[PDB]
């Protein structure tokens, strides 16, 4: 159905279960699965790794019957976090079509970024075109919980307000980006305004103003 | 040493015939194996068929309805279609390359052993989204520098405004520049349409005389637009 | 030989006769056994004593058997004419072969008398083809022994390519003999006549045959 | 020829040899013609009644042996003729050239009448005499 | 020079009879003492040192057709086994109908050892359980919601035999009782029936492991030298062939299915055992020969069929005119009763004395039952119980058993059939050699000795 | 109650070798010794030798200690108490003095004093030691003579000429003629070729229901002579 998690600590190594465990003989292939990225296998042949794949991930061949089939990761780091899946390929089940229930690995005690927000006022040809929109940019952030607030001089927004949920990018920190549509008018009317980003205790807020 | 590339249409109405088209480089299609997986949102992988060396097809039993895969033989390209879509059939395509291994747990005479296979090479991947809404094309603004943080640190970039079709793709000066670019991900606003955002840090002392220009560029719309930003 | 037996000896019919049988002391009769065997000539023996005076199995009690120190008797009684042969002693121990004896005929008086059947051959036609010419005088049924033949060449004596056999006993306990003459065709066509002359000491019968019939 | 005490012929040792020379070792099918003296299930009664066959074997012989003046020795002479009808072979053909078996082939016909003769002729005369001698 | 008679007490004088001859077994003592059903140590314990006597001059004629001791051999195994099954549980009650589903397993292009669910009266009269067991094919006939029933319910009972007694086979010897002896041939070409040169006497046969078998035997005795071909008759058709091997061929059969044992309750203190969920690879008992042994073995083997045969000769044909119980080798081993498919084995095509290439192992499939009707017994079946984890087990093949194809009326060449046309000639591949006869130790003869005269 | 059978005469020149056999039958071969005596013309009977079929132990005398070699063979078992054997003796460095007949001979007993002693005998082989060579006979008609005129009985047969080696055969329509047959001895001619006559005494009336046909074999130089006598006489006594 859906993804089983699990918490590692860094540098320390880790195993992951294999759903539907086999009744007899098994090949499992193990692959290494990013949201929107091309999927890896680390294993194809329970202990065989194809060139390329590091030597820290191992798997658990079936010499004798019983064994248990783990994803064993040594030196976990922040590129080990993924979505694992457990192909599963036994002597006793027909044709094994589906993958594994997807397994969330996720990096415990990696240091928190503090997010980098970037706020960009309506340009002005938007604002020939009748309409007006508030870019609220937020990078570098490893903490993927952060809540945006918007201020319209001391007040809240609240009202179309859009804001993406946190993706994670090349550097293994977040980003996410916060848009808010307003009218040409009630951008003029106002002096300033500001977008509040609290991330973890802290909260950082940038503010503009029209020219 | 084998590269695939997937290409179609990245949008179909409901209930009509999906395409796409896998192209291969590295070697001949009459010797390895190939398959399709789909990659759709909230759910994981999904195996939904294979083609071997010598053309014999083998398809998922839930997805057996409605899907046929081919491959050309002139072409190393193999093709996928799906019949009746549906807006759940939307999902990253992958097509990777699969080869057969052999498992005996007995004698080889009396059966025995199952076949097992392992797709080690895979595609960049295709993105294909349904929807009976038509397409969407994005106007661009610019983001004009705020002159922002010491040290002469400042930050540009370009909007696109909300258009339909996702896939988008953004470089700059022609995909001269690299460095700073963070193109941050689209979001689905309430309008039924997505709107991303692509910034560029750069010094200040360059930020006078940059002749900085993002070009953006659209499938589904079939449109390129170029756009200058100036403070 | 060094075992010796009696050259000869003779009985008269239904009456009993005693063979001898004696040598040195290294074929001495204290400390070995004696034993008898009645082989006539041309066929095979047959035990009739072993072991000394004990005889083998199936001889009549006519035969028995008596062993002095320094020699051993074979008595043979109520004489037939099936006993008229010759006669061999044997001196053996349990692991040494047997030491046979000189031998001993043995001749039945008291006999029936027998006449000579006398029948003369002339050389066949396909024989005086390639330049021989043999008679042949056959002889059977005489039960007296001992025949004598003469060969003669128109009423002459012949003395060249005459070859005559020994007496030799029928299985009807008679005798029978054989002769043959020699001669060329040159002897054979001048001549009368041939005869073959059988002369016993009872009767002498002659039988004569002629080349021109 | 002659074993003092260490032959190990055994139990019919010498059944293919003639018969003076089985006859002077008897005593090893004598110990040996009783050989078993040294639970409902099959082998229960399939023992009980190979037992009991068994002793009773034996006690037919010893109660021949018994009815003929013999029961204490294995060999004894007796007093009856031997009619040469049984047979006509002499002392030497049959002890040196013969074996029990192919003798007791020739004069298994006469047995039973053998067995007759020696218990009447003798024994049954010797014990009415025995008892008339010792009277006076 | 007169003769009396003088009777003689312990003659050897012997005359062949029929005695009821006894078991000997040697003692095994052990603190897990399992008792054995072919060869229970009710029997005599056999003596510690043999004793065979050697009978020179010795000229009898055996008969191994003729003999009395397989016939009591053969009625002797039938009342051992009777024996061991009456105060064992009998499944009558467990006659009610199966529903059945074949076991999961995927088709690579047909399922034999099967599953099927029923009812089972508890230890309790009144109430009623619903359980689960897994029953091959052979065992369960169907009626019509695909019902099934087992295959001896409506021929005769059906009794389980216990799982405290062992279905191996441990050496027996026959013994004669006192005043009787065993004549032994030793010629090293023994013609079937015929005269023995240099016989010998013995008390106790020699350890003869009661093996019931089909087609080709096992763990029997070897003769030396050259091979030898006992026949009754090799002129009829229908006379068995007895075949002997010298060297000893090596089989191996394994069971690779790793089942359970599950105790189920069909009545008060009844236990009824029967197979539970398989665990691991589904697989099928197979048995194998190594073929370079087998080739050589069947090469003289022919060698010694054109002795008795004319110069012109050719092969055989393999198993037709019985039930698939006939067919195939069927034996025991661990406690599972197979039933191989001997065709791979007597392939070949050869004139005047099969691939070049073929595998090293011959591998044959071997069905399995457990509802088992042996020697023809017509009655009372038995239920071999499961045997828990793998089964595994090695024995020697010594003996065949052939049988002529039978032409109607003309022969072309001459072809061959492995049969066993009866169990007996199980017994007569070890009792050739023996025979029974019994002692007769009286004995008159004449000598010049005359009793004492009566005074 | 056994037969003794041994081999067929031979002819071999002075200097060879030879070997006799003699297959028995009728009795446990392996319980009889089995001897070998000669006789010939210069020493009379001559013991040779015994063998044990059973132990394979011989004894020779000292005279043919150096010069024969016996050997027998493995008894075939026909009943319990009988069987069919066969002994062997060979003999070389032949001589002329050598040439005579030779006899095999059953023991006596099992047991005993006399153990050896040559009881059953066999039909002797003929040996003939010469540096000649092998001659065949020539065959010729006796023409029909008569025997008893008031009798009605008449005499015919064939003659035997020059033949080298000594065995003569003779029969009449192929054995079915042995009535009345008389075989003479052989004469021994001053070149060493040997002849004989043989002849037949029939009733004179039978001369068209009769048919008389002498078979004369000579094995050595392995010739038959099949020669039909012609019953027409030329006896004035048989003409009548
Ligand atoms: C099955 O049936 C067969 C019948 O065929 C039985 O064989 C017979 O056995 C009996 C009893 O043993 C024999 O009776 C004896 O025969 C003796 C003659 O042979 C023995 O001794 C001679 C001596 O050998 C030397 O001198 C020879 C001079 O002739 C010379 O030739 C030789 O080379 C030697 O230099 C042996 O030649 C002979 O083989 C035999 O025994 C010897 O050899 C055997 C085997 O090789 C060996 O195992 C022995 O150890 C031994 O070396 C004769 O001497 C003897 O008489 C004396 O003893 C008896 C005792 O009974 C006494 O009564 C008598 O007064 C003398 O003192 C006795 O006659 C019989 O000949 C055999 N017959 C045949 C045909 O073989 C066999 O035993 C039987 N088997 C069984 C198991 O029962
Ligand atoms: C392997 O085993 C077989 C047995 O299956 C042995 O077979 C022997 O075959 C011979 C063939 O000649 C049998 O001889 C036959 O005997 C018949 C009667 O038996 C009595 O007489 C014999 C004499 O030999 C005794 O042995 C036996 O105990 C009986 O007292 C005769 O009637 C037969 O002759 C008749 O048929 C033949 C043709 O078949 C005619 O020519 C005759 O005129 C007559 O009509 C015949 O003689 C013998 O009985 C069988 N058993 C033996 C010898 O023990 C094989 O010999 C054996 N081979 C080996 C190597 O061991
Ligand atoms: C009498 O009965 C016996 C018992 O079965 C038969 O023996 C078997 O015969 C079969 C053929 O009928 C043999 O099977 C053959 O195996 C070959 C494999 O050997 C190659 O590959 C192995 C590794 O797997 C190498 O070690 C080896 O060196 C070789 O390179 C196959 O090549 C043969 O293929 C044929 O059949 C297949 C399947 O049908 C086809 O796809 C092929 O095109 C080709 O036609 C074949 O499968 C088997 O090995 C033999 N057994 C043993 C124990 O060796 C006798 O053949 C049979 N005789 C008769 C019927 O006359
Ligand atoms: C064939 O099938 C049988 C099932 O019938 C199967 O036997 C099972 O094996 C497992 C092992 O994988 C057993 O589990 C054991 O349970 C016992 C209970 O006491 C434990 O003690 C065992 O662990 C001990 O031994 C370890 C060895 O290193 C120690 O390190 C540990 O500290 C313990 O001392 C273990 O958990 C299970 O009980 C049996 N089931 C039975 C016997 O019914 C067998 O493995 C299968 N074989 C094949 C080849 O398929
Ligand atoms: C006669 O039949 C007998 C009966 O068996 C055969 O005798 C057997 O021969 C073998 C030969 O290899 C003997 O084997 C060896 O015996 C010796 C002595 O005991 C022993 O030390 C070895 O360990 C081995 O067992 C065997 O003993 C013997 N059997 C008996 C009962 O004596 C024999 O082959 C046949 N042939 C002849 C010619 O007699
Ligand atoms: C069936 O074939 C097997 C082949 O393995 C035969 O096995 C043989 O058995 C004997 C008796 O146990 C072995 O002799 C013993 O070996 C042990 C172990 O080394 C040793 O300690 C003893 O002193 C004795 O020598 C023999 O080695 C073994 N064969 C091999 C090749 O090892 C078996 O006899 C055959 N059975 C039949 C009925 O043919
Ligand atoms: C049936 O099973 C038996 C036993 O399980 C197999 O017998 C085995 O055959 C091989 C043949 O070489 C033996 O190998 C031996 O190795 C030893 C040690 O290195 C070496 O000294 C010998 O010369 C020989 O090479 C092996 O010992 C033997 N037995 C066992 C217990 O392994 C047989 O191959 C099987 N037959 C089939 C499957 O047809
Ligand atoms: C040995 O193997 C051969 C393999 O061919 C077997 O030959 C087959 O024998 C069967 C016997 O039923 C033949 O069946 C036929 O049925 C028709 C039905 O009308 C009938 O008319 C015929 O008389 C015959 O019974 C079959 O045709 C024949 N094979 C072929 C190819 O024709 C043979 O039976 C085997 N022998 C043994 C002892 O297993
Ligand atoms: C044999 O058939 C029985 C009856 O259908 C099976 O028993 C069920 O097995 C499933 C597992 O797939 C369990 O969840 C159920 O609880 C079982 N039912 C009962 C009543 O116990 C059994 O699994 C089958 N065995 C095999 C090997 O397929
Ligand atoms: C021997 O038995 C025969 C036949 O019964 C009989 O006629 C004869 O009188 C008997 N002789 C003696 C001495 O018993
Ligand atoms: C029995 O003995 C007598 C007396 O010598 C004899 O005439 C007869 O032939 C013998 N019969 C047998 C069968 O030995
Ligand atoms: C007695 O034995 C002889 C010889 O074997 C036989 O002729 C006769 O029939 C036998 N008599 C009886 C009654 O058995
Ligand atoms: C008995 O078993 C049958 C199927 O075997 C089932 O349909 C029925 O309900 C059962 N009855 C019970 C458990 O009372
Ligand atoms: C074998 O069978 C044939 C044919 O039926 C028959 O002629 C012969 O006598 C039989 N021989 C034996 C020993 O059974
Ligand atoms: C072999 O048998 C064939 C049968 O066709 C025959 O022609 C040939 O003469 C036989 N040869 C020998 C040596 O037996
Ligand atoms: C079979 O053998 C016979 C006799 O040896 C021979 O004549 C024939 O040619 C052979 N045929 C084949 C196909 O081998
Ligand atoms: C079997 O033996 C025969 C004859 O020796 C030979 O021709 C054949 O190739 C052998 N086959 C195998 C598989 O060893």
């Known amino acids: 159905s859906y993804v089983s998690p699990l918490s590692v600590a860094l540098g320390e190594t880790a195993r992951i279960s294999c759903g539907r465990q086999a009744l007899g003989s098994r090949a499992v292939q193990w692959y290494q699965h990013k949201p929107g990225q091309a999927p890896i296998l680390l294993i194809y042949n329970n202990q065989d790794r194809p060139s390329g794949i590091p030597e820290r991930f191992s798997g658990t061949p079936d010499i004798n019957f019983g064994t248990t089939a783990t994803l064993t990761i040594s030196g976990v780091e922040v590129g080990d976090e993924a979505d694992y899946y457990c192909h599963m390929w036994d002597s006793r089940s027909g044709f094994s079509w589906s993958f594994g229930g997807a397994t969330r690995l996720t990096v415990l005690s990696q240091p928190k970024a503090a997010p980098s927000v970037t706020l960009f006022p309506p340009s002005s040809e938007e604002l020939q075109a009748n309409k007006a929109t508030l870019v609220c940019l937020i990078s570098d952030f490893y903490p993927g919980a952060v809540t945006v607030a918007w201020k319209a001089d001391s007040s809240p927004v609240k009202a179309g307000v859009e804001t993406t949920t946190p993706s994670k990018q090349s550097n293994n920190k977040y980003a996410a980006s916060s848009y808010l549509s307003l009218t040409p008018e009630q951008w003029k009317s106002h002096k300033s305004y500001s977008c509040q980003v609290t991330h973890e205790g802290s909260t950082v807020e940038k503010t503009v103003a029209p020219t | 040493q084998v590269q695939l590339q997937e290409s179609g249409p990245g949008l179909v109405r409901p209930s009509e015939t999906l395409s796409v088209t896998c192209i291969v480089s590295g070697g001949s299609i009459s010797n390895y194996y190939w398959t399709w997986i789909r990659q759709s949102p909230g759910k994981g992988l999904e195996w939904i068929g294979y083609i071997s060396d010598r053309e014999t097809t083998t398809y998922n039993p839930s997805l057996n309805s409605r899907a046929v895969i081919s491959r050309d033989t002139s072409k190393n390209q193999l093709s996928l279609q799906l019949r009746s879509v549906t807006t759940a059939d939307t999902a990253i395509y992958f097509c990777a390359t699969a080869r057969r291994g052999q498992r005996i747990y007995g004698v080889v005479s009396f059966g025995e052993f199952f076949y097992y296979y392992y797709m080690d090479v895979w595609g960049k991947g295709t993105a294909v989204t349904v929807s009976s809404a038509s397409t969407k094309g994005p106007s661009v603004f610019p983001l004009a520098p705020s002159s922002s943080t010491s040290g002469g640190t400042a930050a540009l970039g370009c909007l696109v405004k909300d258009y339909f079709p996702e896939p988008v793709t953004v470089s700059w000066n022609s995909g001269a520049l690299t460095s700073g670019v963070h193109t941050f991900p689209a979001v689905l606003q309430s309008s039924g349409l997505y709107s991303l955002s692509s910034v560029v840090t750069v010094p200040s002392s360059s930020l006078g005389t940059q002749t900085y220009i993002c070009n953006v560029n659209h499938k589904p719309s079939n449109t390129k637009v170029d756009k200058k930003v100036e403070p | 030989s060094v075992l010796t037996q009696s050259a000869s000896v003779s009985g008269s019919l239904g009456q009993s006769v005693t063979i001898s049988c004696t040598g040195p002391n290294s074929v001495c009769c204290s400390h070995k056994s004696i034993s008898w065997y009645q082989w006539p000539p041309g066929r095979a023996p047959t035990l009739i004593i072993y072991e000394d005076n004990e005889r083998a199995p199936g001889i009549s009690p006519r035969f028995s058997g008596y062993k002095s120190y320094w020699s051993a008797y074979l008595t043979i009684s109520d004489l037939r004419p099936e006993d008229e042969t010759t006669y061999y002693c044997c001196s053996y121990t349990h692991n040494s072969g047997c030491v046979f004896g000189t031998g001993t005929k043995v001749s039945v008086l008291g006999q029936s008398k027998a006449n000579p059947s006398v029948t003369l051959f002339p050389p066949s036609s396909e024989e005086l083809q390639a330049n021989k010419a043999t008679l042949v005088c056959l002889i059977s049924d005489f039960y007296p022994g001992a025949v004598t033949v003469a060969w003669k060449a128109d009423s002459s004596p012949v003395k060249a390519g005459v070859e005559t056999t020994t007496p030799s006993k029928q299985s009807n306990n008679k005798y029978a003999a054989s002769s043959y003459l020699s001669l060329t065709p040159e002897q054979w066509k001048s001549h009368r006549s041939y005869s073959c002359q059988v002369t016993h000491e009872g009767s002498t019968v002659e039988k004569t045959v002629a080349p021109t019939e | 020829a002659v074993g003092l005490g260490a032959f190990i012929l055994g139990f019919l040792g010498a059944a293919g040899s003639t018969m003076g020379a089985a006859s002077m070792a008897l005593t090893v099918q004598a110990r040996l013609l009783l050989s078993g003296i040294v639970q409902l299930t099959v082998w229960g009664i399939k023992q009980l009644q190979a037992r009991v066959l068994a002793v009773e074997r034996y006690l037919r012989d010893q109660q021949l042996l018994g009815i003929w003046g013999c029961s204490g020795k294995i060999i004894c002479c007796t007093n009856v003729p031997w009619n040469d009808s049984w047979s006509n072979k002499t002392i030497n053909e049959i002890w040196d050239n013969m074996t029990w078996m192919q003798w007791e082939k020739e004069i298994d016909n006469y047995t039973q009448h053998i067995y007759t003769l020696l218990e009447v002729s003798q024994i049954q005369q010797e014990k009415n005499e025995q008892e008339l001698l010792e009277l006076d | 020079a007169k003769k009396w008679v003088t009777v003689y007490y312990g003659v050897p004088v012997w005359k062949e009879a029929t005695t009821t001859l006894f078991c000997a077994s040697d003692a095994k003592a052990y603190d897990t003492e399992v008792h054995n059903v072919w060869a229970t140590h009710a029997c005599v314990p056999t003596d510690p040192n043999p004793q065979e006597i050697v009978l020179g001059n010795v000229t009898e004629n055996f008969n191994m057709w003729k003999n009395n001791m397989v016939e009591q051999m053969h009625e002797d195994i039938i009342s051992l086994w009777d024996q061991s099954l009456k105060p064992c549980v009998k499944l009558t009650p467990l006659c009610v109908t199966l529903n059945c589903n074949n076991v999961n397993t995927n088709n690579t292009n047909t399922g034999e050892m099967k599953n099927c669910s029923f009812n089972v009266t508890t230890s309790i009269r009144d109430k009623i359980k619903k359980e689960y067991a897994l029953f091959y094919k052979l065992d369960v006939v169907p009626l019509e919601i695909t019902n099934y029933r087992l295959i001896n319910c409506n021929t005769s009972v059906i009794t389980q035999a216990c799982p405290k007694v062992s279905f191996e086979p441990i050496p027996i010897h026959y013994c004669a009782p006192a005043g009787f002896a065993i004549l032994k041939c030793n010629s090293k070409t023994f013609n079937g029936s015929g005269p023995c040169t240099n016989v010998s006497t013995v008390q106790c046969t020699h350890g003869i492991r009661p093996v019931v078998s089909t087609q080709l035997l096992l763990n029997g005795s070897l003769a030396e030298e050259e091979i030898v071909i006992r026949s009754e008759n090799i002129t009829d058709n229908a006379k068995t062939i007895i075949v002997q091997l010298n060297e000893a061929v090596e089989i191996n059969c394994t069971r690779p299915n790793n089942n359970t044992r599950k105790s189920i309750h069909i009545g008060p203190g009844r236990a009824f055992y029967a197979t539970g969920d398989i665990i691991g690879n589904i697989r099928q008992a197979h048995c194998n020969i190594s073929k370079a042994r087998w080739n050589e073995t069947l090469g003289q083997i022919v060698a010694k069929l054109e002795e008795q045969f004319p110069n012109k000769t050719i092969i055989f044909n393999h198993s037709s005119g019985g039930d698939p119980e006939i067919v195939t080798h069927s034996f025991n081993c661990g406690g599972e009763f197979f039933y191989c498919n001997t065709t791979p084995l007597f392939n070949s095509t050869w004139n005047n004395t099969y691939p070049t290439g073929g595998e090293q192992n011959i591998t044959l499939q071997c069905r399995i039952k457990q509802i088992i009707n042996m020697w023809q017994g017509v009655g009372k079946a038995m239920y071999a119980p499961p045997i828990r984890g793998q089964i595994r087990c090695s024995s020697n093949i010594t003996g065949l058993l052939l049988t002529r194809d039978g032409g109607r009326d003309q022969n072309g060449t001459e072809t061959f059939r492995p049969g066993g046309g009866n169990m007996r000639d199980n017994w007569r591949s070890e009792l050739y050699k023996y025979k029974v006869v019994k002692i007769e130790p009286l004995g008159i003869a004449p000598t010049a000795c005359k009793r004492r005269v009566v005074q | 109650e056994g037969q003794l059978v041994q081999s067929g005469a031979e002819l071999k020149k002075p200097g060879a070798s030879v070997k006799i056999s003699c297959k028995t039958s009728?009795?446990?071969?392996?319980?009889?010794?089995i001897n070998w005596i000669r006789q010939t013309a210069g020493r009379g009977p001559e013991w040779m030798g015994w063998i044990s079929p059973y132990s394979g132990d011989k004894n020779l005398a000292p005279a043919f200690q150096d010069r024969v070699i016996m050997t027998t063979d493995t008894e075939v078992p026909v009943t319990s108490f009988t069987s069919t054997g066969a002994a062997y003796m060979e003999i070389r460095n032949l001589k002329f003095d050598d040439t005579g007949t030779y006899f095999c001979?059953?023991?006596?007993?099992?047991?005993?004093?006399?153990?050896?002693?040559?009881?059953?005998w066999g039909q002797g082989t003929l040996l003939t030691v010469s540096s000649a060579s092998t001659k065949g006979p020539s065959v010729f008609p006796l023409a029909p003579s008569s025997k008893s005129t008031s009798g009605g009985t008449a005499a015919l047969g064939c003659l035997v000429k020059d033949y080298f080696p000594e065995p003569v055969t003779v029969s009449w329509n192929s054995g079915a003629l042995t009535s009345g047959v008389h075989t003479f001895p052989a004469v021994l001619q001053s070149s060493g070729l040997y002849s004989l006559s043989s002849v037949v005494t029939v009733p004179s009336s039978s001369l068209g229901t009769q048919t008389y046909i002498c078979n004369v074999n000579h094995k050595p130089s392995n010739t038959k002579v099949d020669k039909r006598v012609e019953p027409k006489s030329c006896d004035k006594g048989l003409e009548v």
């Open positions: 001979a059953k023991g006596l007993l099992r047991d005993g004093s006399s153990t050896w002693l040559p009881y059953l």
């Open positions: 009728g009795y446990r071969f392996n319980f009889y010794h």
